């Protein structure tokens, strides 16, 4: 009764605040063109399918994680390897790079987050306390980290004490990914209940909830200015949302796309949006006007992870055939 | 000049170590007990690995795709729920070509084999058992599965 009335009121307010679309205002901008990109590097050292990857702050080093139980640190300029770290548990599905560059993190089906130190490689900490498998983890600092788990919760930890500083709760499905804002004051989350949520790190409470998809949400990322975000789902669509307007603006889909979306990322200026799919290749979308402008197709299995440099000079894609490809 | 020499020397040792783990990875067979803990054992100079998942929720549609390269699935048997889960696993996209070792009389076996032989196009089978005998049974079914895979590879089946 009360919940239905509140939902109806929120819907009416949402309809009232909307007067124009993103397509009508961007009907005069010049189109991007045909984006043609080719493979510049090929990194091949893993034995099983790759699950996650993260770039580095200097845009030259990156870390990769695979289901065979290994963490590999690369040098994309010379293709030479740097560090190879074996893991205690073979089922790892996330990895992260510290902004300073002297820490890495990983986690998976063991419901534990492990942090390793590179400037000694020996393990530094083993945070436990979740009830389900970890899906994502992002560093904020040398002593702060945010994680999301399969028990429908997110967490903010303190590495020095090894304890859980804050717990974010309210989702009704497995939380799949998280994305941290440039201001580091808030972040966003998506789960399997077909909804996304905005969390404030300082206070620790949910501020806004967005509901536009029809199935589970797989990937999420922030826009460069921090005033919007995009998310991909299992219904073969992508959607862009807004914070000051609090509603969806644009959707990206095609009539011949059936598979779901696994990864999502943005370009330097926000003009391009990269989406990895389950049909072995990934697409490029124009953010201002929803229109496909390029295809990266070199992998024999499904693309699982996607990243773009901090300088915007190259993109890196991992896959289930155990290869990492750099495109530019 | 010296930095590049050091970098190449560092990469060479990594490659030499990595080439050692591939032989260990291809010589072991993985299993999955579906009634995370890991148990490794050896039978007739053959390495075997088994994992059990019981620390997760009863929503398997997301963490079950991590086990798409396993050799076989050990299903321990309410009958209708087991049949429905068997049908759900049998028709998945990533776990499509996966054999199931049942551990349960002839009526139930026939009902399971009815859904087992409905589809598959001769890519996976079902091995029902009525229960140090279990390990031997699993060993025999694994040998049969790998032999059939090799037969398909060499164009003899």
């Amino acid at each position, epitope marked *: 009764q009360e919940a239905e009335q509140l939902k109806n009121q929120i819907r009416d307010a949402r309809k009232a605040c909307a007067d124009a679309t993103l397509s009508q205002i961007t009907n005069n901008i010049d189109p991007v063109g045909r984006i043609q990109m080719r493979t510049r590097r090929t990194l091949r050292g893993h034995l099983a399918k790759i699950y996650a990857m993260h770039w580095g702050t200097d845009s030259r080093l990156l870390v990769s994680a695979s289901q065979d139980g290994k963490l590999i640190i690369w040098d994309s300029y010379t293709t030479n390897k740097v560090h190879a770290i074996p893991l205690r548990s073979s089922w790892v599905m996330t990895c992260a790079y510290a902004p300073s560059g002297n820490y890495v993190a990983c986690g998976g089906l063991d419901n534990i987050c492990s942090i390793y130190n590179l400037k000694t490689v020996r393990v530094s900490r083993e945070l436990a306390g979740h009830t389900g498998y970890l899906s994502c983890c992002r560093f904020l600092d040398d002593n702060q980290i945010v994680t999301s788990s399969g028990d429908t919760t997110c967490a903010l930890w303190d590495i020095e004490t090894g304890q859980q500083t804050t717990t974010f709760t309210g989702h*009704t*499905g497995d939380v799949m990914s998280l994305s941290l804002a440039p201001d580091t004051r808030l972040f966003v989350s998506g789960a*399997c*209940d*077909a909804s996304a949520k905005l969390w404030d790190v300082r206070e620790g409470m949910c501020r806004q909830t967005f509901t536009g998809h*029809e*199935s*589970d949400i797989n990937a999420i990322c922030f826009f460069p200015n921090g005033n919007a975000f995009a998310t991909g789902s*299992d*219904d*073969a669509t992508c959607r862009l949302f807004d914070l000051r307007a609090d509603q969806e603006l644009m959707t990206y889909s095609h009539d011949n796309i*059936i598979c*779901g979306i696994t990864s999502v990322s943005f370009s330097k200026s926000g003009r391009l949006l990269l989406a990895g799919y389950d049909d072995f290749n990934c697409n490029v979308w124009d953010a201002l006007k929803a229109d496909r402008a390029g295809v990266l197709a070199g992998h024999d299995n499904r693309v699982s992870c996607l990243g773009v440099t901090d300088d915007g000079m190259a993109v890196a894609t991992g896959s289930w055939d155990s290869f990492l490809k750099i495109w530019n | 000049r010296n930095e590049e020499k050091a970098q190449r020397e560092a990469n060479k040792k990594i490659e030499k170590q990595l080439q050692k783990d591939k032989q260990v990875y291809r010589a072991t067979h993985r299993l999955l007990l579906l009634g995370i803990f890991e148990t490794k054992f050896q039978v007739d100079k053959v390495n075997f690995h088994m994992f059990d998942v019981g620390g997760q*929720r*009863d*929503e*398997r*549609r997301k963490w*079950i795709q991590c086990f798409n390269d396993v050799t076989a699935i050990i299903f321990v048997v309410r009958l*209708q*729920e087991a049949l*429905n889960l068997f049908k*759900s*696993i049998w*028709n*998945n*996209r990533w776990l499509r070509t996966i054999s199931v070792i049942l551990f349960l009389k002839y009526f139930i076996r026939d009902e399971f084999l009815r859904i087992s032989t409905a589809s598959g196009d001769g890519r996976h089978y079902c091995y029902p058992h009525f229960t140090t005998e279990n390990i031997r049974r699993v060993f025999n079914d694994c040998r049969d599965i790998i032999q059939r895979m090799h037969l398909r590879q060499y164009e003899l089946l």
Partner: nanobody
Amino acid sequence: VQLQESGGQPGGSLRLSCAASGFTFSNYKMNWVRQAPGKGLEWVSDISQSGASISYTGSVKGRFTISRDNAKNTLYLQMNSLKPEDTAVYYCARCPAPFTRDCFDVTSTTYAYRGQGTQVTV
């Protein structure tokens, strides 16, 4: 995603309807599940995207009929000669992913794509 269920002496007849909003009804596989008092959730009946393939549990095979209407995005369950052993709360579940032949977690507790249920006592 919203699913609303409505409707509901031994040997009688009854009919339940369920209306769906928020998603494309045509390309999803739908099903009826039941929860009896003293037991857990159970699977009752299934129906495909176009109604070509229909599946029933052995307990109610023959007595009950499940149908679907894509023009009005609603589905129906018709039960005849109901027995007192059929008193339970009926839910309408929806398969999580489109264009798929697998439906994993419809009988799980804390499922997200399931309605509120209607009580039937016979």
